[PDB]
Amino acid sequence: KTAVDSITQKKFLCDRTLWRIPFSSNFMSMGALTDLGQNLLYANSAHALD
Amino acid sequence: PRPPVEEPAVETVSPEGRGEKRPRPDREETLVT
């Protein structure tokens, strides 16, 4: 009955893993050689990455 | 390492090795994949 005014702190811990961002047009693994890796945009040109 | 596969080319997933209800234990009969 004497509970203080309390606020929720949220977080997560995700050990042992690497934050994978796949270079795929739908972020899915449809093969080891992805569809954007075979795309003619990235295969016939040079692009900067920032 | 790879699920079973038929070859009609096209490459078709084979239904062998799947789990079923059996009156007798399935390891002494088949390989279950």
Partner: peptide, 29 residues
């Protein structure tokens, strides 16, 4: 032929699957 190098389950040589010849695994690919 190379089918006499396989164990005979019955009278048939137990040949391995054609799908087990190469590896395809990568780090999520």
């Amino acid at each position: 032929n190379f089918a006499s190098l396989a164990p005979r389950h019955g009278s048939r040589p137990f040949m391995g699957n054609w799908q087990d010849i190469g590896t395809s695994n990568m780090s999520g690919g």
